[PDB]
Ligand binder design. Structure first.
Ligand SMILES: C[C@@H](CNC(=O)c1ccc2c(c1)NC(=O)CCS2)N1CCOCC1
Ligand SMILES: C[C@@H](CNC(=O)c1ccc2c(c1)NC(=O)CCS2)N1CCOCC1
Length: 130
């Protein structure tokens, strides 16, 4: 319905705003764009589903997220990709893992404080009805 489309539009506005705040945080610069295969040629064979904050914006605009739960699956994917690709004790790996966990924790904290739980419940019930 039209009222439901208004709900999903508000969801998209909210998600663009959260995503922008993550993307401008200097800690998360490494997550802002797709990984370049020239810099790390082994990435596409290890990481089966690359994800990054620019791709998240593209998916918002393609209406791929109908709930914040589905949005957070892609944030979690950015983080789990980083943990999987950087598992070693080396400081370069440990820095990226720390940033990845900070990205996840920051996204979840913004949503816990700013997402109304009845709004999310409404999105989930619309999604379930289709
Ligand atoms: C400028 C682009 C492209 N850079 C890379 O994809 C990249 C991936 C892994 C490493 C490095 C660069 N750096 C190294 O020193 C080699 C070992 S780790 N970035 C992509 C992610 O977000 C935006 C910026
Ligand atoms: C080895 C680098 C630290 N690592 C990165 O800068 C980096 C950049 C982009 C990505 C990644 C790492 N890897 C990921 O998995 C996230 C998505 S791409 N150092 C930087 C300072 O000087 C020395 C070397």
């Amino acid at each position: 319905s039209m009222q439901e489309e208004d709900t999903f539009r508000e969801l998209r506005i909210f998600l663009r705003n959260v995503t922008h705040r993550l993307a401008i945080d200097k800690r998360f610069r490494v997550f802002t764009k797709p990984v370049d295969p020239d810099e790390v040629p082994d990435y596409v064979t290890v990481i089966k589903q690359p994800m990054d904050l620019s791709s998240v914006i593209s998916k918002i605009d393609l209406h791929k997220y109908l709930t914040v739960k589905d949005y957070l699956r892609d944030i979690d994917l950015i983080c789990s990709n980083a943990l999987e690709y950087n598992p070693d004790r080396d400081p370069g790996d440990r820095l990226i893992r720390h940033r990845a966990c900070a990205l996840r924790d920051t996204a979840y904290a913004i949503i816990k404080e700013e997402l109304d739980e009845d709004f999310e419940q409404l999105c989930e019930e619309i999604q379930e009805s289709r």
